[PDB]
Amino acid sequence: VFVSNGTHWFVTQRNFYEPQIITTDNTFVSGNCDVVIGIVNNTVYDPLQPELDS
Amino acid sequence: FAMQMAYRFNGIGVTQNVLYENQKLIANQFNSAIGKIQDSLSSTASALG
């Protein structure tokens, strides 16, 4: 589930707080922003880009 | 409550996007179905048999 400490956005297990940096490994795409009530503008990290840049 | 129902869907193997991308429709189906409970219970004494 998504959470913020107040400044940064994390994803965590539902039953024990373990904040992970949000990536396309933790998260699945669907549709576009318009349809979801209460969606938030944020950054998702892409683990492949530094590996291609290196 | 929308994030609870997204877990309720996840618990039947229906992925969470099937909830938020239909949220108003799911809310209206719940509200309409709740409306039919009043009419069902009000109309016949046989339901509490």
PDB file of N, CA and C in Angstrom:
ATOM      1  N   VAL A   1       0.848  -1.187   0.000  1.00  0.00           N
ATOM      2  CA  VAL A   1       0.000   0.000   0.000  1.00  0.00           C
ATOM      3  C   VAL A   1       0.880   1.231   0.000  1.00  0.00           C
ATOM      4  N   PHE A   2       0.449   2.324  -0.622  1.00  0.00           N
ATOM      5  CA  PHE A   2       1.236   3.551  -0.634  1.00  0.00           C
ATOM      6  C   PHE A   2       1.071   4.337   0.655  1.00  0.00           C
ATOM      7  N   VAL A   3       2.150   4.958   1.111  1.00  0.00           N
ATOM      8  CA  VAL A   3       2.168   5.846   2.271  1.00  0.00           C
ATOM      9  C   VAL A   3       3.176   6.959   2.082  1.00  0.00           C
ATOM     10  N   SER A   4       3.021   8.044   2.828  1.00  0.00           N
ATOM     11  CA  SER A   4       4.070   9.033   3.008  1.00  0.00           C
ATOM     12  C   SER A   4       4.347   9.284   4.479  1.00  0.00           C
ATOM     13  N   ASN A   5       5.626   9.456   4.811  1.00  0.00           N
ATOM     14  CA  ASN A   5       6.051  10.006   6.096  1.00  0.00           C
ATOM     15  C   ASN A   5       5.605  11.474   6.257  1.00  0.00           C
ATOM     16  N   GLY A   6       5.430  12.190   5.146  1.00  0.00           N
ATOM     17  CA  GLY A   6       5.060  13.600   5.053  1.00  0.00           C
ATOM     18  C   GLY A   6       5.767  14.327   3.906  1.00  0.00           C
ATOM     19  N   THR A   7       6.878  13.784   3.404  1.00  0.00           N
ATOM     20  CA  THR A   7       7.740  14.426   2.395  1.00  0.00           C
ATOM     21  C   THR A   7       8.024  13.529   1.196  1.00  0.00           C
ATOM     22  N   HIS A   8       8.094  12.214   1.406  1.00  0.00           N
ATOM     23  CA  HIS A   8       8.421  11.210   0.395  1.00  0.00           C
ATOM     24  C   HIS A   8       7.360  10.123   0.364  1.00  0.00           C
ATOM     25  N   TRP A   9       7.167   9.502  -0.791  1.00  0.00           N
ATOM     26  CA  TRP A   9       6.191   8.433  -0.976  1.00  0.00           C
ATOM     27  C   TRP A   9       6.877   7.077  -1.059  1.00  0.00           C
ATOM     28  N   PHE A  10       6.334   6.117  -0.320  1.00  0.00           N
ATOM     29  CA  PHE A  10       6.833   4.761  -0.169  1.00  0.00           C
ATOM     30  C   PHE A  10       5.706   3.762  -0.392  1.00  0.00           C
ATOM     31  N   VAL A  11       6.055   2.520  -0.690  1.00  0.00           N
ATOM     32  CA  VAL A  11       5.126   1.391  -0.654  1.00  0.00           C
ATOM     33  C   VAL A  11       5.563   0.427   0.429  1.00  0.00           C
ATOM     34  N   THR A  12       4.617  -0.171   1.135  1.00  0.00           N
ATOM     35  CA  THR A  12       4.888  -1.001   2.312  1.00  0.00           C
ATOM     36  C   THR A  12       3.966  -2.201   2.370  1.00  0.00           C
ATOM     37  N   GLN A  13       4.386  -3.271   3.042  1.00  0.00           N
ATOM     38  CA  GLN A  13       3.498  -4.384   3.377  1.00  0.00           C
ATOM     39  C   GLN A  13       2.264  -3.860   4.128  1.00  0.00           C
ATOM     40  N   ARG A  14       1.114  -4.527   4.012  1.00  0.00           N
ATOM     41  CA  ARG A  14      -0.119  -4.051   4.658  1.00  0.00           C
ATOM     42  C   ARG A  14      -0.101  -4.190   6.185  1.00  0.00           C
ATOM     43  N   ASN A  15       0.613  -5.180   6.732  1.00  0.00           N
ATOM     44  CA  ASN A  15       0.538  -5.590   8.146  1.00  0.00           C
ATOM     45  C   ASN A  15       1.826  -5.382   8.961  1.00  0.00           C
ATOM     46  N   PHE A  16       2.813  -4.690   8.400  1.00  0.00           N
ATOM     47  CA  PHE A  16       4.043  -4.303   9.083  1.00  0.00           C
ATOM     48  C   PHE A  16       4.717  -3.178   8.302  1.00  0.00           C
ATOM     49  N   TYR A  17       4.965  -2.030   8.918  1.00  0.00           N
ATOM     50  CA  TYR A  17       5.539  -0.885   8.227  1.00  0.00           C
ATOM     51  C   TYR A  17       6.979  -1.169   7.801  1.00  0.00           C
ATOM     52  N   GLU A  18       7.187  -1.320   6.498  1.00  0.00           N
ATOM     53  CA  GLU A  18       8.489  -1.454   5.858  1.00  0.00           C
ATOM     54  C   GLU A  18       8.513  -0.622   4.568  1.00  0.00           C
ATOM     55  N   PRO A  19       8.900   0.657   4.644  1.00  0.00           N
ATOM     56  CA  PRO A  19       8.840   1.550   3.511  1.00  0.00           C
ATOM     57  C   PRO A  19       9.909   1.191   2.493  1.00  0.00           C
ATOM     58  N   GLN A  20       9.489   0.961   1.255  1.00  0.00           N
ATOM     59  CA  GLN A  20      10.363   0.733   0.114  1.00  0.00           C
ATOM     60  C   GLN A  20      10.241   1.890  -0.870  1.00  0.00           C
ATOM     61  N   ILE A  21      11.359   2.285  -1.478  1.00  0.00           N
ATOM     62  CA  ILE A  21      11.373   3.262  -2.568  1.00  0.00           C
ATOM     63  C   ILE A  21      10.508   2.722  -3.702  1.00  0.00           C
ATOM     64  N   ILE A  22       9.614   3.540  -4.256  1.00  0.00           N
ATOM     65  CA  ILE A  22       8.630   3.041  -5.213  1.00  0.00           C
ATOM     66  C   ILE A  22       9.278   2.850  -6.584  1.00  0.00           C
ATOM     67  N   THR A  23       9.132   1.649  -7.136  1.00  0.00           N
ATOM     68  CA  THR A  23       9.646   1.268  -8.452  1.00  0.00           C
ATOM     69  C   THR A  23       8.653   0.404  -9.217  1.00  0.00           C
ATOM     70  N   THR A  24       8.897   0.228 -10.512  1.00  0.00           N
ATOM     71  CA  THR A  24       8.133  -0.681 -11.379  1.00  0.00           C
ATOM     72  C   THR A  24       8.246  -2.164 -10.994  1.00  0.00           C
ATOM     73  N   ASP A  25       9.133  -2.538 -10.067  1.00  0.00           N
ATOM     74  CA  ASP A  25       9.116  -3.862  -9.442  1.00  0.00           C
ATOM     75  C   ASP A  25       7.987  -3.995  -8.408  1.00  0.00           C
ATOM     76  N   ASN A  26       7.781  -2.983  -7.557  1.00  0.00           N
ATOM     77  CA  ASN A  26       6.719  -2.992  -6.547  1.00  0.00           C
ATOM     78  C   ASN A  26       5.337  -2.685  -7.136  1.00  0.00           C
ATOM     79  N   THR A  27       5.269  -2.067  -8.320  1.00  0.00           N
ATOM     80  CA  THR A  27       4.038  -1.462  -8.847  1.00  0.00           C
ATOM     81  C   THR A  27       3.693  -1.843 -10.284  1.00  0.00           C
ATOM     82  N   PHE A  28       2.397  -1.986 -10.559  1.00  0.00           N
ATOM     83  CA  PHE A  28       1.856  -2.292 -11.876  1.00  0.00           C
ATOM     84  C   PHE A  28       1.096  -1.102 -12.460  1.00  0.00           C
ATOM     85  N   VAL A  29       1.248  -0.880 -13.760  1.00  0.00           N
ATOM     86  CA  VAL A  29       0.570   0.187 -14.496  1.00  0.00           C
ATOM     87  C   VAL A  29      -0.904  -0.141 -14.704  1.00  0.00           C
ATOM     88  N   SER A  30      -1.774   0.864 -14.700  1.00  0.00           N
ATOM     89  CA  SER A  30      -3.100   0.731 -15.308  1.00  0.00           C
ATOM     90  C   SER A  30      -3.647   2.071 -15.792  1.00  0.00           C
ATOM     91  N   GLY A  31      -4.126   2.145 -17.031  1.00  0.00           N
ATOM     92  CA  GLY A  31      -4.845   3.311 -17.554  1.00  0.00           C
ATOM     93  C   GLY A  31      -4.061   4.626 -17.517  1.00  0.00           C
ATOM     94  N   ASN A  32      -4.759   5.715 -17.192  1.00  0.00           N
ATOM     95  CA  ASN A  32      -4.214   7.065 -17.039  1.00  0.00           C
ATOM     96  C   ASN A  32      -4.834   7.781 -15.821  1.00  0.00           C
ATOM     97  N   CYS A  33      -4.231   8.889 -15.388  1.00  0.00           N
ATOM     98  CA  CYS A  33      -4.571   9.585 -14.142  1.00  0.00           C
ATOM     99  C   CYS A  33      -6.047   9.991 -13.986  1.00  0.00           C
ATOM    100  N   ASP A  34      -6.741  10.338 -15.071  1.00  0.00           N
ATOM    101  CA  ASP A  34      -8.073  10.964 -15.028  1.00  0.00           C
ATOM    102  C   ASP A  34      -9.134  10.165 -14.258  1.00  0.00           C
ATOM    103  N   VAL A  35      -9.055   8.837 -14.285  1.00  0.00           N
ATOM    104  CA  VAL A  35     -10.149   7.961 -13.845  1.00  0.00           C
ATOM    105  C   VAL A  35     -10.139   7.698 -12.335  1.00  0.00           C
ATOM    106  N   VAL A  36      -8.983   7.790 -11.673  1.00  0.00           N
ATOM    107  CA  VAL A  36      -8.826   7.424 -10.256  1.00  0.00           C
ATOM    108  C   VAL A  36      -9.119   8.602  -9.330  1.00  0.00           C
ATOM    109  N   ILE A  37     -10.149   8.474  -8.496  1.00  0.00           N
ATOM    110  CA  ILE A  37     -10.464   9.450  -7.443  1.00  0.00           C
ATOM    111  C   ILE A  37      -9.354   9.421  -6.387  1.00  0.00           C
ATOM    112  N   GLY A  38      -8.744  10.564  -6.076  1.00  0.00           N
ATOM    113  CA  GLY A  38      -7.722  10.670  -5.025  1.00  0.00           C
ATOM    114  C   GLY A  38      -6.291  10.261  -5.406  1.00  0.00           C
ATOM    115  N   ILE A  39      -5.985  10.027  -6.681  1.00  0.00           N
ATOM    116  CA  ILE A  39      -4.610   9.778  -7.141  1.00  0.00           C
ATOM    117  C   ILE A  39      -3.684  10.980  -6.903  1.00  0.00           C
ATOM    118  N   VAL A  40      -2.389  10.740  -6.675  1.00  0.00           N
ATOM    119  CA  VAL A  40      -1.399  11.785  -6.355  1.00  0.00           C
ATOM    120  C   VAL A  40      -0.249  11.838  -7.352  1.00  0.00           C
ATOM    121  N   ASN A  41       0.157  13.040  -7.762  1.00  0.00           N
ATOM    122  CA  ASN A  41       1.332  13.242  -8.616  1.00  0.00           C
ATOM    123  C   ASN A  41       2.614  12.951  -7.818  1.00  0.00           C
ATOM    124  N   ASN A  42       3.474  12.069  -8.328  1.00  0.00           N
ATOM    125  CA  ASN A  42       4.690  11.608  -7.654  1.00  0.00           C
ATOM    126  C   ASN A  42       5.730  11.052  -8.659  1.00  0.00           C
ATOM    127  N   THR A  43       6.919  10.639  -8.212  1.00  0.00           N
ATOM    128  CA  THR A  43       7.938   9.966  -9.041  1.00  0.00           C
ATOM    129  C   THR A  43       7.980   8.469  -8.759  1.00  0.00           C
ATOM    130  N   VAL A  44       8.027   7.632  -9.799  1.00  0.00           N
ATOM    131  CA  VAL A  44       8.399   6.209  -9.695  1.00  0.00           C
ATOM    132  C   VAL A  44       9.794   6.001 -10.270  1.00  0.00           C
ATOM    133  N   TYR A  45      10.686   5.384  -9.504  1.00  0.00           N
ATOM    134  CA  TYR A  45      12.036   5.093  -9.962  1.00  0.00           C
ATOM    135  C   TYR A  45      12.026   3.868 -10.897  1.00  0.00           C
ATOM    136  N   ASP A  46      12.805   3.922 -11.978  1.00  0.00           N
ATOM    137  CA  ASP A  46      12.955   2.848 -12.964  1.00  0.00           C
ATOM    138  C   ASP A  46      14.336   2.181 -12.801  1.00  0.00           C
ATOM    139  N   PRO A  47      14.432   0.978 -12.203  1.00  0.00           N
ATOM    140  CA  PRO A  47      15.710   0.363 -11.836  1.00  0.00           C
ATOM    141  C   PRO A  47      16.672   0.120 -13.005  1.00  0.00           C
ATOM    142  N   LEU A  48      16.159   0.085 -14.237  1.00  0.00           N
ATOM    143  CA  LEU A  48      16.948  -0.182 -15.432  1.00  0.00           C
ATOM    144  C   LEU A  48      17.797   1.023 -15.871  1.00  0.00           C
ATOM    145  N   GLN A  49      17.365   2.266 -15.631  1.00  0.00           N
ATOM    146  CA  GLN A  49      18.020   3.431 -16.249  1.00  0.00           C
ATOM    147  C   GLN A  49      19.483   3.633 -15.819  1.00  0.00           C
ATOM    148  N   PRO A  50      19.858   3.549 -14.527  1.00  0.00           N
ATOM    149  CA  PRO A  50      21.265   3.599 -14.127  1.00  0.00           C
ATOM    150  C   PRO A  50      22.100   2.458 -14.719  1.00  0.00           C
ATOM    151  N   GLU A  51      21.515   1.269 -14.894  1.00  0.00           N
ATOM    152  CA  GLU A  51      22.176   0.130 -15.528  1.00  0.00           C
ATOM    153  C   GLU A  51      22.463   0.370 -17.016  1.00  0.00           C
ATOM    154  N   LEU A  52      21.568   1.067 -17.728  1.00  0.00           N
ATOM    155  CA  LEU A  52      21.804   1.518 -19.106  1.00  0.00           C
ATOM    156  C   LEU A  52      22.763   2.716 -19.181  1.00  0.00           C
ATOM    157  N   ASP A  53      22.725   3.625 -18.205  1.00  0.00           N
ATOM    158  CA  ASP A  53      23.620   4.783 -18.134  1.00  0.00           C
ATOM    159  C   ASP A  53      25.072   4.396 -17.806  1.00  0.00           C
ATOM    160  N   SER A  54      25.267   3.405 -16.936  1.00  0.00           N
ATOM    161  CA  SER A  54      26.568   2.812 -16.623  1.00  0.00           C
ATOM    162  C   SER A  54      27.150   2.018 -17.804  1.00  0.00           C
TER     163      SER A  54
ATOM    164  N   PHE B   1     -12.027   4.234   2.727  1.00  0.00           N
ATOM    165  CA  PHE B   1     -12.917   3.123   2.371  1.00  0.00           C
ATOM    166  C   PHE B   1     -12.725   2.594   0.943  1.00  0.00           C
ATOM    167  N   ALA B   2     -12.389   3.452  -0.017  1.00  0.00           N
ATOM    168  CA  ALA B   2     -12.041   2.995  -1.355  1.00  0.00           C
ATOM    169  C   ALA B   2     -10.801   2.100  -1.337  1.00  0.00           C
ATOM    170  N   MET B   3      -9.821   2.398  -0.486  1.00  0.00           N
ATOM    171  CA  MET B   3      -8.621   1.581  -0.344  1.00  0.00           C
ATOM    172  C   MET B   3      -8.897   0.291   0.408  1.00  0.00           C
ATOM    173  N   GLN B   4      -9.878   0.257   1.307  1.00  0.00           N
ATOM    174  CA  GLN B   4     -10.336  -1.011   1.851  1.00  0.00           C
ATOM    175  C   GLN B   4     -10.960  -1.857   0.754  1.00  0.00           C
ATOM    176  N   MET B   5     -11.908  -1.336  -0.019  1.00  0.00           N
ATOM    177  CA  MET B   5     -12.540  -2.135  -1.067  1.00  0.00           C
ATOM    178  C   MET B   5     -11.549  -2.605  -2.120  1.00  0.00           C
ATOM    179  N   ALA B   6     -10.491  -1.851  -2.395  1.00  0.00           N
ATOM    180  CA  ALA B   6      -9.423  -2.330  -3.247  1.00  0.00           C
ATOM    181  C   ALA B   6      -8.718  -3.553  -2.666  1.00  0.00           C
ATOM    182  N   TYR B   7      -8.526  -3.650  -1.347  1.00  0.00           N
ATOM    183  CA  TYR B   7      -8.073  -4.899  -0.734  1.00  0.00           C
ATOM    184  C   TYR B   7      -9.142  -5.986  -0.794  1.00  0.00           C
ATOM    185  N   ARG B   8     -10.431  -5.669  -0.616  1.00  0.00           N
ATOM    186  CA  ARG B   8     -11.484  -6.689  -0.721  1.00  0.00           C
ATOM    187  C   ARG B   8     -11.496  -7.344  -2.103  1.00  0.00           C
ATOM    188  N   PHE B   9     -11.343  -6.560  -3.171  1.00  0.00           N
ATOM    189  CA  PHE B   9     -11.164  -7.060  -4.538  1.00  0.00           C
ATOM    190  C   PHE B   9      -9.867  -7.864  -4.678  1.00  0.00           C
ATOM    191  N   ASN B  10      -8.749  -7.369  -4.153  1.00  0.00           N
ATOM    192  CA  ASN B  10      -7.483  -8.085  -4.225  1.00  0.00           C
ATOM    193  C   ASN B  10      -7.591  -9.472  -3.576  1.00  0.00           C
ATOM    194  N   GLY B  11      -8.399  -9.603  -2.527  1.00  0.00           N
ATOM    195  CA  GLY B  11      -8.655 -10.854  -1.817  1.00  0.00           C
ATOM    196  C   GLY B  11      -9.523 -11.875  -2.559  1.00  0.00           C
ATOM    197  N   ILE B  12     -10.157 -11.506  -3.677  1.00  0.00           N
ATOM    198  CA  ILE B  12     -10.866 -12.421  -4.598  1.00  0.00           C
ATOM    199  C   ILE B  12     -10.156 -12.565  -5.954  1.00  0.00           C
ATOM    200  N   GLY B  13      -8.882 -12.186  -6.038  1.00  0.00           N
ATOM    201  CA  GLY B  13      -8.096 -12.293  -7.267  1.00  0.00           C
ATOM    202  C   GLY B  13      -8.574 -11.368  -8.385  1.00  0.00           C
ATOM    203  N   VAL B  14      -9.218 -10.249  -8.045  1.00  0.00           N
ATOM    204  CA  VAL B  14      -9.563  -9.183  -8.989  1.00  0.00           C
ATOM    205  C   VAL B  14      -8.655  -7.999  -8.689  1.00  0.00           C
ATOM    206  N   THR B  15      -7.803  -7.592  -9.622  1.00  0.00           N
ATOM    207  CA  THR B  15      -6.736  -6.629  -9.307  1.00  0.00           C
ATOM    208  C   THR B  15      -7.288  -5.233  -9.016  1.00  0.00           C
ATOM    209  N   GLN B  16      -6.613  -4.468  -8.158  1.00  0.00           N
ATOM    210  CA  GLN B  16      -7.130  -3.224  -7.573  1.00  0.00           C
ATOM    211  C   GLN B  16      -7.614  -2.194  -8.598  1.00  0.00           C
ATOM    212  N   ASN B  17      -7.031  -2.156  -9.793  1.00  0.00           N
ATOM    213  CA  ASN B  17      -7.441  -1.242 -10.849  1.00  0.00           C
ATOM    214  C   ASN B  17      -8.885  -1.458 -11.298  1.00  0.00           C
ATOM    215  N   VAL B  18      -9.421  -2.669 -11.168  1.00  0.00           N
ATOM    216  CA  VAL B  18     -10.839  -2.948 -11.404  1.00  0.00           C
ATOM    217  C   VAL B  18     -11.737  -2.214 -10.416  1.00  0.00           C
ATOM    218  N   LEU B  19     -11.253  -1.814  -9.233  1.00  0.00           N
ATOM    219  CA  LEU B  19     -12.024  -0.962  -8.331  1.00  0.00           C
ATOM    220  C   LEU B  19     -11.923   0.519  -8.679  1.00  0.00           C
ATOM    221  N   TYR B  20     -10.759   1.159  -8.556  1.00  0.00           N
ATOM    222  CA  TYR B  20     -10.708   2.616  -8.709  1.00  0.00           C
ATOM    223  C   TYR B  20     -11.141   3.081 -10.101  1.00  0.00           C
ATOM    224  N   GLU B  21     -10.812   2.339 -11.159  1.00  0.00           N
ATOM    225  CA  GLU B  21     -11.246   2.705 -12.507  1.00  0.00           C
ATOM    226  C   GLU B  21     -12.758   2.521 -12.737  1.00  0.00           C
ATOM    227  N   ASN B  22     -13.486   1.956 -11.769  1.00  0.00           N
ATOM    228  CA  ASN B  22     -14.941   1.814 -11.750  1.00  0.00           C
ATOM    229  C   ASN B  22     -15.561   2.325 -10.435  1.00  0.00           C
ATOM    230  N   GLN B  23     -14.897   3.207  -9.680  1.00  0.00           N
ATOM    231  CA  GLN B  23     -15.296   3.462  -8.294  1.00  0.00           C
ATOM    232  C   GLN B  23     -16.721   3.997  -8.167  1.00  0.00           C
ATOM    233  N   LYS B  24     -17.098   5.013  -8.956  1.00  0.00           N
ATOM    234  CA  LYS B  24     -18.459   5.573  -8.898  1.00  0.00           C
ATOM    235  C   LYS B  24     -19.518   4.539  -9.257  1.00  0.00           C
ATOM    236  N   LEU B  25     -19.241   3.702 -10.254  1.00  0.00           N
ATOM    237  CA  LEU B  25     -20.126   2.616 -10.659  1.00  0.00           C
ATOM    238  C   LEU B  25     -20.284   1.569  -9.551  1.00  0.00           C
ATOM    239  N   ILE B  26     -19.205   1.224  -8.856  1.00  0.00           N
ATOM    240  CA  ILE B  26     -19.243   0.272  -7.747  1.00  0.00           C
ATOM    241  C   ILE B  26     -20.002   0.864  -6.562  1.00  0.00           C
ATOM    242  N   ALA B  27     -19.775   2.139  -6.251  1.00  0.00           N
ATOM    243  CA  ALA B  27     -20.509   2.851  -5.222  1.00  0.00           C
ATOM    244  C   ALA B  27     -22.007   2.926  -5.550  1.00  0.00           C
ATOM    245  N   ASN B  28     -22.376   3.257  -6.789  1.00  0.00           N
ATOM    246  CA  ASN B  28     -23.773   3.282  -7.222  1.00  0.00           C
ATOM    247  C   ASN B  28     -24.424   1.900  -7.191  1.00  0.00           C
ATOM    248  N   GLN B  29     -23.717   0.836  -7.572  1.00  0.00           N
ATOM    249  CA  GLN B  29     -24.242  -0.519  -7.434  1.00  0.00           C
ATOM    250  C   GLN B  29     -24.444  -0.900  -5.971  1.00  0.00           C
ATOM    251  N   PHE B  30     -23.527  -0.537  -5.071  1.00  0.00           N
ATOM    252  CA  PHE B  30     -23.742  -0.758  -3.647  1.00  0.00           C
ATOM    253  C   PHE B  30     -24.936   0.050  -3.125  1.00  0.00           C
ATOM    254  N   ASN B  31     -25.022   1.345  -3.435  1.00  0.00           N
ATOM    255  CA  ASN B  31     -26.113   2.220  -3.000  1.00  0.00           C
ATOM    256  C   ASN B  31     -27.481   1.764  -3.528  1.00  0.00           C
ATOM    257  N   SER B  32     -27.567   1.363  -4.795  1.00  0.00           N
ATOM    258  CA  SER B  32     -28.783   0.803  -5.391  1.00  0.00           C
ATOM    259  C   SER B  32     -29.160  -0.540  -4.765  1.00  0.00           C
ATOM    260  N   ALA B  33     -28.194  -1.437  -4.560  1.00  0.00           N
ATOM    261  CA  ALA B  33     -28.435  -2.714  -3.902  1.00  0.00           C
ATOM    262  C   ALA B  33     -28.921  -2.537  -2.464  1.00  0.00           C
ATOM    263  N   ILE B  34     -28.347  -1.600  -1.705  1.00  0.00           N
ATOM    264  CA  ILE B  34     -28.836  -1.196  -0.380  1.00  0.00           C
ATOM    265  C   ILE B  34     -30.266  -0.654  -0.463  1.00  0.00           C
ATOM    266  N   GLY B  35     -30.583   0.151  -1.476  1.00  0.00           N
ATOM    267  CA  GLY B  35     -31.946   0.622  -1.726  1.00  0.00           C
ATOM    268  C   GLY B  35     -32.947  -0.525  -1.888  1.00  0.00           C
ATOM    269  N   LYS B  36     -32.609  -1.556  -2.670  1.00  0.00           N
ATOM    270  CA  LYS B  36     -33.454  -2.749  -2.823  1.00  0.00           C
ATOM    271  C   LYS B  36     -33.634  -3.538  -1.527  1.00  0.00           C
ATOM    272  N   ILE B  37     -32.697  -3.489  -0.576  1.00  0.00           N
ATOM    273  CA  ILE B  37     -32.897  -4.148   0.723  1.00  0.00           C
ATOM    274  C   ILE B  37     -34.069  -3.518   1.470  1.00  0.00           C
ATOM    275  N   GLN B  38     -34.183  -2.187   1.480  1.00  0.00           N
ATOM    276  CA  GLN B  38     -35.308  -1.537   2.156  1.00  0.00           C
ATOM    277  C   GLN B  38     -36.642  -1.955   1.558  1.00  0.00           C
ATOM    278  N   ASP B  39     -36.769  -1.901   0.235  1.00  0.00           N
ATOM    279  CA  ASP B  39     -37.995  -2.292  -0.451  1.00  0.00           C
ATOM    280  C   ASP B  39     -38.329  -3.771  -0.228  1.00  0.00           C
ATOM    281  N   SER B  40     -37.332  -4.657  -0.274  1.00  0.00           N
ATOM    282  CA  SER B  40     -37.505  -6.087  -0.010  1.00  0.00           C
ATOM    283  C   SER B  40     -38.035  -6.351   1.403  1.00  0.00           C
ATOM    284  N   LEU B  41     -37.406  -5.750   2.420  1.00  0.00           N
ATOM    285  CA  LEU B  41     -37.804  -5.888   3.824  1.00  0.00           C
ATOM    286  C   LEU B  41     -39.135  -5.192   4.141  1.00  0.00           C
ATOM    287  N   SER B  42     -39.416  -4.054   3.506  1.00  0.00           N
ATOM    288  CA  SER B  42     -40.650  -3.280   3.693  1.00  0.00           C
ATOM    289  C   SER B  42     -41.867  -3.952   3.043  1.00  0.00           C
ATOM    290  N   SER B  43     -41.694  -4.536   1.855  1.00  0.00           N
ATOM    291  CA  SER B  43     -42.789  -5.089   1.049  1.00  0.00           C
ATOM    292  C   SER B  43     -43.427  -6.360   1.631  1.00  0.00           C
ATOM    293  N   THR B  44     -42.633  -7.365   2.032  1.00  0.00           N
ATOM    294  CA  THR B  44     -43.145  -8.670   2.504  1.00  0.00           C
ATOM    295  C   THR B  44     -42.692  -9.014   3.925  1.00  0.00           C
ATOM    296  N   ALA B  45     -43.610  -9.510   4.760  1.00  0.00           N
ATOM    297  CA  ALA B  45     -43.279 -10.060   6.079  1.00  0.00           C
ATOM    298  C   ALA B  45     -42.544 -11.416   6.003  1.00  0.00           C
ATOM    299  N   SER B  46     -42.618 -12.109   4.859  1.00  0.00           N
ATOM    300  CA  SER B  46     -42.061 -13.458   4.683  1.00  0.00           C
ATOM    301  C   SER B  46     -40.529 -13.516   4.762  1.00  0.00           C
ATOM    302  N   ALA B  47     -39.819 -12.410   4.515  1.00  0.00           N
ATOM    303  CA  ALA B  47     -38.357 -12.400   4.490  1.00  0.00           C
ATOM    304  C   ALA B  47     -37.737 -12.778   5.852  1.00  0.00           C
ATOM    305  N   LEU B  48     -38.327 -12.304   6.957  1.00  0.00           N
ATOM    306  CA  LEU B  48     -37.900 -12.620   8.327  1.00  0.00           C
ATOM    307  C   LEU B  48     -38.470 -13.949   8.841  1.00  0.00           C
ATOM    308  N   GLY B  49     -38.921 -14.834   7.954  1.00  0.00           N
ATOM    309  CA  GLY B  49     -39.603 -16.072   8.320  1.00  0.00           C
ATOM    310  C   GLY B  49     -38.860 -16.910   9.358  1.00  0.00           C
TER     311      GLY B  49
END
